[PDB]
Amino acid sequence: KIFSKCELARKLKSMGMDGFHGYSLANWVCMAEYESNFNTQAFQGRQSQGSSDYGIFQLNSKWWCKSQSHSSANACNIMCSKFLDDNIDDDIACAKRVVKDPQGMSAWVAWVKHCKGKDLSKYLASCNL
């Protein structure tokens, strides 16, 4: 499933993301756009050792969820496979956990290179929330 900007913006407001750990809804949505183009099935196999990135938040297995051959630290306490799913609920709860670390939202690269430096005050403007 691919979400639209506003669709997602609505979803996240719903699940308590507006201002969650100092980050505005704009922020979260932008991370998403830049990380997966809003694709719940987005996946990226990293050529490192056993870390791949999952779902709309491109959630890494080295840290965050379990893989297969590839064991994890499993911060989020979930099977990484749970993220390649149409339902964004655990994807989000994992996302809220990621944010807690020192790096916060910079855990997410696309976010850093595409959104951190941007003025996102108009980002959501077209959205009925």
Side-chain angles (χ1 to χ4, degrees):
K1 188 207 146 31
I2 305 117
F3 282 78
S4 99
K5 155 148 97 174
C6 306
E7 188 188 1
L8 178 66
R10 279 174 306 261
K11 176 45 165 193
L12 315 180
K13 183 165 190 233
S14 97
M15 303 295 289
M17 304 291 259
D18 198 6
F20 185 81
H21 260 72
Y23 310 90
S24 65
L25 202 40
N27 264 286
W28 284 118
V29 180
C30 192
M31 171 279 270
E33 183 194 337
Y34 299 88
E35 290 282 349
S36 60
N37 180 242
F38 299 142
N39 203 163
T40 62
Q41 261 97 232
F43 178 112
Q44 184 59 40
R46 293 335 199 149
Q47 19 104 241
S48 314
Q49 65 180 199
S51 91
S52 294
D53 307 306
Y54 297 79
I56 198 172
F57 301 152
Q58 287 281 285
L59 308 181
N60 211 260
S61 68
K62 187 114 158 333
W63 294 265
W64 321 102
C65 40
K66 185 200 322 263
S67 270
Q68 303 226 28
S69 304
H70 15 109
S71 72
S72 315
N74 215 10
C76 286
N77 247 294
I78 196 143
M79 280 315 132
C80 304
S81 144
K82 262 270 214 158
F83 299 135
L84 272 202
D85 250 34
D86 303 298
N87 201 295
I88 83 133
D89 298 334
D90 26 52
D91 279 279
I92 288 151
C94 175
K96 299 152 139 179
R97 167 41 178 149
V98 178
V99 100
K100 339 187 187 285
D101 273 46
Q103 216 151 80
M105 287 199 76
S106 277
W108 283 285
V109 185
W111 183 83
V112 187
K113 352 136 78 155
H114 302 293
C115 321
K116 191 168 151 187
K118 260 267 174 29
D119 161 357
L120 308 162
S121 65
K122 291 337 229 177
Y123 187 76
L124 305 187
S126 79
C127 315
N128 321 286
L129 275 99

